[PDB]
Design a protein around this ligand. Structure first.
Ligand code: CL
Ligand code: CL
Ligand code: CL
Length: 196
């Protein structure tokens, strides 16, 4: 699959759930905690369906996290993606707490300068060091502007083709699910399809 797309489970499974999610969205964090287990044991493990996670990148903080999760091998993506989502409350504090002068650096200057400022402010060096990724490996990841452009293009595809606006959003078998932005609304639609 293309950059910013990641597939969990069997590509030939009949039910394909696409998730448009963002690392800076509180609804996506809550959704991951609520849904990850049940989707795995109920659907993915028995080979009844597969999950395509798309990084819907909303802001440069999101972009910085998505550079990290997309720079690791496919077999590490899902653990890392889940970790950022599950531990969102632990790392996202500077979004609320930072001052004007700090915020200025996230939204101005070149891609490299702002990505480095964000990674510093959000303490991603320490977060990723605690997960085996050293500073040199993280530096290379954060400077991958080519990848940032591809993730931006993937995000633009979601916005343009599917009118994706709020997060998380979902499609099942090509249909974007109206009014469906949490596990409580999603699950009955998944079970209806599985149990047809
Ligand atoms: Cl939820
Ligand atoms: Cl740090
Ligand atoms: Cl498009």
């Amino acid at each position: 699959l293309a950059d910013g797309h990641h597939l969990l489970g069997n590509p030939a499974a009949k039910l394909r759930l696409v998730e448009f999610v963002s690392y800076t969205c509180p609804h996506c964090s809550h959704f991951e905690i609520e849904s990850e287990g049940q989707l795995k044991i109920g659907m993915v493990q028995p080979g009844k369906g597969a999950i395509e996670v798309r990084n819907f990148v909303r802001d440069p903080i999101d972009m910085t996290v998505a550079l990290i999760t997309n720079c690791v091998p496919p077999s590490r993506f899902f653990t890392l993606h889940t970790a950022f989502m599950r531990s969102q409350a632990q790392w996202i504090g500077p979004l609320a707490n930072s001052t004007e002068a700090q915020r200025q650096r996230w939204f101005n200057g070149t891609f490299a300068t702002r990505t480095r400022a964000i990674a510093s402010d959000f303490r991603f060096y320490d977060f990723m060091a605690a997960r085996g990724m050293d500073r040199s490996t993280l530096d290379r990841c954060l400077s991958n502007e080519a990848l940032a452009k591809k993730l931006a293009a993937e995000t633009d595809e979601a916005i343009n083709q599917y009118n994706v606006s709020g997060t998380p959003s979902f499609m099942i078998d090509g249909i974007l699910l109206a009014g469906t932005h949490d596990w409580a609304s999603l699950r009955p639609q998944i079970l209806a399809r599985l149990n047809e």
